[PDB]
Structure formats: structure tokens, C-alpha cells
Paper text:
NadR converts NR into nicotinamide mononucleotide (NMN) and subsequently into NAD. While NadR proteins from Haemophilus sp. and most Gram-negative bacteria contain a DNA binding domain at the N terminus, such a domain is absent in the NadRLl protein, indicating that NadRLl is not involved in transcriptional regulation.
NadRLl crystallized in the P6422 space group with two molecules in the asymmetric unit. Additionally, we obtained structures in the presence of NMN and NR, which both have bound substrates in a similar area. The measured binding affinities for Mg2+-complexed ATP and AMP-PNP are 63 µM and 13 µM, respectively.
Author numbering: 8 to 303, 313 to 347, 352 to 375
């Protein structure tokens, strides 16, 4: 189930940062021509992919998941940490690659077809066929378009979203988070933003937690704030990874806004016990634009300026200030929606109509 079955198989290379429609189209054509296909993800320790947060391992794992139900397609990893352009290193890169073939196949006396898209690779590869019983052959592939699409996807992700393979999409998603008091225009604001650009959105986990377990704000305890941290995060993850994500998604609240309600309203010894779960979660969050509703749930209502001042205190603590936009109105914009909807334009780049 984990080594390639057939007798003649073909080989397809790539950095795969990210994998996209182009690749897949070339791969299924490649699969229908052989009995099996060996994908080879190539990477080195600070390559184009790694620089944007998709290191060789991250790419490999995502690729394994992407082909997780294709029996006759195996994903391999060719790690490149050796000599540059004037090497005997082609000698070595070769048998690194031929190691991948021997390990991920049964059935000696194979018939291998390399599908290479760079001419120097085919020239240096043909010099280094090993003396097993396999008789390798090289064919040329048009990667002019495929490498060029990957270039554009990395540059403008939300412009080529539908061609990014779904496993890689969670990494390119823009994320807008709204934070604020029980001045919960935020929930209506979050919907109105997302539904105006057909985006998905999360809901305040605290509201759902309190209703399901049936407790008011004053009755929340340390054990409950921890359940709300992971609750809200999972809700937000669920949307970022949602199949209905079109490139940006909106989060109703954060671990920070639940940590503000937790430094307030919670004994200093108790709060200090949660700080590790708080770091772990806030570190696992990635936000692009943070919208804050200024002072305009029963216990969380009354302390608006208390919460709002502490919220900025914490937001500085985590260096998120330059992603923060405050939806004020007086003394610029007509409605806080107007201010907010235009903020999304500046921070994600989607087109919006005028009245
Ligand atoms: N059938 C199934 O597949 C199935 C069924 C039940 C459970 N599960 C489990 O559920 C999981 C599904 O995915 P997951 O929840 O583990 O994903 P995950 O927790 O691995 O994803 C977290 C990543 O997404 C980003 N992220 C998440 N929330 C964010 C936010 N609010 N803002 C910015 N960035 C954010 C982070 O950068 C982080 O690296 C699987 O790991 C699986 O084990 C799967």
C-alpha cells in the first residue's frame, strides 16, 4: 500500500510551493500513461518555498495529504544540501534521487520514464543512469506555464485562489479578526462584511459556550476560560480551513479578546495559570487585519472602557498594533461599516462598489 505497484512507472519533479491545478493536470496525464507515478518534492534549507513558510518538509507533508487516496501515486522528498553548479554533486544528487526510486518501488526490472522540464537536468540525468535492471528513459515536459503559475500564486494568492490545491489554501488565506466589548455590533458587523464579498465567518464562541452550558458571565471560572480559548480557536480554524473560503475569512473573536476578559474578571493566580495556554494559542494565530470597535452578555457589557483600554494594552503586548484599525465615528467615514469595508480593501485588495 506504500510502495509503488506497477512494473513501468513514471517520475515527476517539483518544488510544489504551492501545488496547483497545473501540476495536478500534468500529473493525472502522467498517471494515465504509466502504472504508477513517483512525485519528487525538492527542497533546500532556505529555498523560495521555505522563505514564504512552506519548507521542504511542510511541502512534503501537504503533498502526502493531497494525494492521500491515490493508490498508484507516491510522494517522495529529495533533500538538496550539497555542492552548487560546478559539482561532482550531480553525481551525488543523482543517486540521492535513485535512492528514492529503489526504496519506493517493488518489482525489479522496472521501466522508468523521467518527465523533466529543464534541459540541463535531462542532460546531466542521462549521464547517471545506474546499473540496476531498470533501463530509465527521459521525456521532456512543458513547465513554462506551470512554474510561471506558481510564481503568480505566491505573489497574488487571492487572485489565483481557485487553482491553489485545497491543502495549501489554509496557508494563503487572508484573515480579518474583529475585537470588541459586549458592544456587539461586532457580530452584525462581521456578517455584513463577509456577506458583502461572499466570505465565510466565525461566531463568538463565548456566546455559544454560555448558552449551551447555561452560565452567565459572572459564573465563568478558570476552567471555563480555558474551554473558551480552544473553543474559539477551533471555530476560527474551522472557517480558515473552510471549503467555502474564497481567499479571505472573518473571525468574530480572538484568543486575545478572550484573554482580556480573563485578565479582568479572574483571580491573578488563576489568570497566571492560563498564560501558557494563552501563548500557545495566540502564537498559532495569524491575522492580517484587526478591527476594534470602541466603546459606544451582562457583566462584560458594563465595563466598556475598562475592557477597551486593556484590549489595546494587550494588543501592544503582542506587537499587533500595525494590523489594528479602530472604527471610530466623529470629530472621516459615514458609518463604522463604511470605515470597516474600506479597511478590508486596503489590507486584502478586494473590489467594492459605491453608493
Ligand atoms: N475526518 C477528518 O478529517 C477529521 C475528523 C475529526 C477530527 N479531525 C481532526 O481535526 C483536524 C482538522 O484540522 P485542524 O483543526 O487540526 O487544523 P490545524 O489546527 O492543524 O490548523 C492550524 C493552522 O491554521 C492556522 N490558523 C488556525 N486558526 C487560525 C486563526 N484563527 N487565525 C489565523 N490562523 C489560524 C495556524 O497558522 C495553524 O498553523 C485534523 O488535524 C484532524 O486530526 C479530522
Amino acid at each position: 500500500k506504500s510502495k509503488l505497484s506497477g512494473k513501468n512507472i513514471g517520475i515527476y519533479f517539483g518544488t510544489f510551493a504551492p501545488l496547483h491545478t497545473g501540476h495536478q493536470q500534468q500529473i493525472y496525464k502522467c498517471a494515465s500513461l504509466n502504472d504508477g507515478v513517483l512525485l519528487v518534492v525538492s527542497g533546500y534549507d532556505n529555498d523560495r518555498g521555505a522563505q514564504i513558510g512552506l519548507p521542504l518538509e511542510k511541502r512534503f507533508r501537504y503533498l502526502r495529504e493531497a494525494f492521500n487516496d491515490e493508490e498508484n501515486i507516491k510522494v517522495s522528498m529529495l533533500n538538496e544540501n550539497d555542492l552548487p553548479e560546478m559539482p561532482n554533486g550531480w553525481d551525488e544528487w543523482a543517486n540521492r534521487l535513485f535512492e528514492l526510486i529503489h526504496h519506493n518501488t517493488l518489482e525489479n526490472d522496472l521501466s522508468v520514464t523521467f518527465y523533466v522540464g529543464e534541459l540541463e537536468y535531462a542532460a546531466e540525468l542521462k549521464k547517471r543512469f545506474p546499473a540496476d535492471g531498470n533501463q530509465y528513459a527521459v521525456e521532456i515536459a512543458d513547465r513554462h506555464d506551470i512554474s510561471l503559475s506558481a510564481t503568480q500564486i505566491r505573489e497574488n494568492p487571492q487572485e489565483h485562489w481557485t487553482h491553489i490545491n485545497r491543502v495549501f489554501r489554509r496557508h494563503f488565506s487572508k484573515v480579518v479578526t474583529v475585537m470588541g466589548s459586549a458592544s456587539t455590533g461586532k457580530t452584525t458587523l462581521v456578517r455584513r462584511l463577509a456577506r458583502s464579498i461572499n466570505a465565510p465567518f466565525s461566531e463568538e464562541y463565548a456566546r455559544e459556550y454560555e448558552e449551551a452550558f447555561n452560565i452567565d458571565d459572572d459564573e465563568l471560572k478558570m476552567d471555563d476560560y480555558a474551554r473558551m480559548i480552544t473553543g474559539q480557536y477551533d471555530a476560527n480554524s474551522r472557517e480558515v480551513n473552510s471549503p467555502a473560503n474564497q481567499g479571505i475569512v472573518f473571525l468574530d473573536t480572538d484568543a486575545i479578546v478572550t484573554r482580556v476578559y480573563a485578565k479582568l474578571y479572574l483571580p491573578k493566580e488563576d489568570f497566571e495559570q492560563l498564560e501558557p495556554l494563552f501563548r500557545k494559542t495566540i502564537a498559532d494565530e495569524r491575522m492580517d487585519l484587526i478591527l476594534v470597535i470602541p466603546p459606544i452578555h451582562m457583566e462584560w457589557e458594563e465595563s466598556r472602557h475598562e475592557f477597551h483600554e486593556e484590549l489595546m494594552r494587550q494588543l501592544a503586548e503582542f506587537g499587533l498594533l500595525d494590523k489594528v484599525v479602530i472604527l471610530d465615528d466623529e470629530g472621516g467615514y459615514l458609518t463604522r461599516y463604511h470605515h470597516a469595508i474600506d479597511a478590508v480593501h486596503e489590507y486584502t485588495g478586494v473590489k467594492i462598489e459605491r453608493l
